Amino acid sequence: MPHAFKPGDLVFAKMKGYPHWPARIDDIADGAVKPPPNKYPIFFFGTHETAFLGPKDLFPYDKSKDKYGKPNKRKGFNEGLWEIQNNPHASYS
Numbered sequence: 001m002p003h004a005f006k007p008g009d010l011v012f013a014k015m016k017g018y019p020h021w022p023a024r025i026d027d028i029a030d031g032a033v034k035p036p037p038n039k040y041p042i043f044f045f046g047t048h049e050t051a052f053l054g055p056k057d058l059f060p061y062d063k064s065k066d067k068y069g070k071p072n073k074r075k076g077f078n079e080g081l082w083e084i085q086n087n088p089h090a091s092y093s
Contacts, residue, residue: 007026012058019068045083046081
């Protein structure tokens with residue numbers, strides 16, 4: 001059975017106007033800006049941008065990759081597909 005989301009989990013993350021996007025739940029480093037309550041820090045692969053999202057917009061990667069894990073024209077998307085599959089826990093800073 002599923003647990004709550006935790007740092008390191010791999011997802012497709014959905015935002016308004018963008019396709020379901022390969023991403024991970026990030027850790028929050030000491031000193032770093034914390035998310036709002038009930039929100040997680042989401043690191044988007046390829047673009048390397050961060051946004052704060054709740055679970056309604058987070059689709060676990062294993063379950064969802066057959067649907068959402070296909071090339072897209074959008075900037076950074078296909079780079080992001082490579083990262084999530086090949087080195088999803090690397091430093092992209």
